[PDB]
């Protein structure tokens, strides 16, 4: 065994607190220290602190002293991480490591935004002459919350010529685009649909790409 198993993803409102957990299995949880690491696209990896299941001695990174709080429980074989007075800034993937074995990470998202179903818009080329041997069509999913969204074209039959793009963020609401490239003999004769699903708000929408009139 190597194992370290982390708590589940958390979606939290600003000013609250979360307590992450990191379960150790297959070794004697007491003989090695657990370290908590922060991952942000903007900042790479950052060390928060570490705890000794054995001696109970905590070390904190000066940046995180006062935000983070490590603790342990010897019977459960788990190390905890209470992050406090959260702000946008704490949104990231948090890990638990022993230096040799890492947990899987637990994602935290701190936001004020309520559930918001997307707005799907179809993106057809411009009216006149723009038809070479292939045409590219589009689809715009704007304004959702929170993150996961399923986007498919003609529910699976189209996969070759698809490009969906990592959702950006625009005022705390997500925005996503997807493109599709087909032959001239395909559209607009046969129909091309933009399938969009957002479980959270329970939206399932097919939006056809009609030619511009």
């Amino acid at each position: 065994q190597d194992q370290l198993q982390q708590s589940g993803a958390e979606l939290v409102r600003p000013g609250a607190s979360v307590k992450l957990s990191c379960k150790a299995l297959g070794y004697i949880f007491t003989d090695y220290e657990i370290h908590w690491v922060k991952q942000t696209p903007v900042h790479g990896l950052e060390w928060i602190g570490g705890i000794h299941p054995g001696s109970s001695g905590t070390a904190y990174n000066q940046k995180f002293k006062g935000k983070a709080t490590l603790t342990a429980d010897k019977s459960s074989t788990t190390a905890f991480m209470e992050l406090s007075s959260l702000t946008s800034e704490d949104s990231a993937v948090y890990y638990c490591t022993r230096k040799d074995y890492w947990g899987q990470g637990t994602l935290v998202t701190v936001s004020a935004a309520k559930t918001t179903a997307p707005s799907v818009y179809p993106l057809v080329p411009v009216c006149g002459g723009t038809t070479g041997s292939s045409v590219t069509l589009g689809c715009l999913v704007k304004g959702y919350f929170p993150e996961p969204v399923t986007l498919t074209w003609n529910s699976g039959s189209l996969s070759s010529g698809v490009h969906t793009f990592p959702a950006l963020l625009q005022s705390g609401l997500y925005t996503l685009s997807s493109s599709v490239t087909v032959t001239s003999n395909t559209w607009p004769s046969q129909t091309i649909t933009c399938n969009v699903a957002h479980p959270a708000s329970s939206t399932k929408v097919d939006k056809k790409i009609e030619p511009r009139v």
């Binding site: 707005s119 818009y121 993106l123 590219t136 589009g138 715009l140 493109s179």
Partner: peptide, 18 residues
């Protein structure tokens, strides 16, 4: 490929060019 906004979107107030 460039894409003028969609009419449905223009009805709301926003105009996204992609």
């Amino acid at each position: 490929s460039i894409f003028p906004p969609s009419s449905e979107q223009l009805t709301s107030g926003g105009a996204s060019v992609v």
